[PDB]
Amino acid sequence: GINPTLFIAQLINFLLLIFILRALLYRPVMNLLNERTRRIEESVRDAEKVR
Amino acid sequence: EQLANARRDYEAEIARARQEAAKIVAQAQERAKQQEAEIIAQARREAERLKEEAR
């Protein structure tokens, strides 16, 4: 009906991939942080330069 | 670039204010000389004409 070893093999690999993605999510997190920080810096810089 | 060069822009504004501070005096002095010369010449011609008319 179901292979007991197949479930363990899938679960371990999925957990390892999720753990890598969490570390790899810091890379996407940094990319999004740079993308948002461009506008964050601009929101202050434009008004400061105008004044 | 803009935030970094804002200090240079403020320094340039101060420098422009300083440059204008003396240009305002210089241009006014030139106009003073011109107006004084014109008035003096006109009144001297009037003085010569008045001397002839008084004779």
Q: What is the dihedral of CA B43, B48, B53, B54, to 10 degrees?
A: 90
d(CA B49, CA B51): 5
Cβ neighbours of B45 (radius 10 Å): 10
Give the residue from A40, A45, A46 with the most B CB atoms within 10 Å of its CB, the best one to mutate.
A45
* Span between the terminal Cα atoms of chain B, in Å: 79
State the CB neighbour count (10 A cutoff) for residue B6: 14
Helix or strand or coil: residue A30?
Answer: helix
Amino acid at A5: T
- CB contacts of A45 in chain B (<8 Å) are 2-3
Resolution in A: 3.0
Residue A29's φ and ψ, nearest 5 degrees, are -65, -45
Q: Extract the runs of DSSP E, i.e. beta strands, from chain B.
A: none
Residues of chain A neighbouring B6 (CB-CB closer than 8 A) = 48-49
Q: For residue A21, give both structure tokens.
A: 């993605």
Residue B39 main-chain phi, psi, to 5 deg:
-65, -45
Tokens 């240009």 locate to B23
**A-chain residues near B3 (CB < 8 A):** 45, 48-49
Residue A3 dihedral angles phi and psi, to the nearest 5°: -85, 120
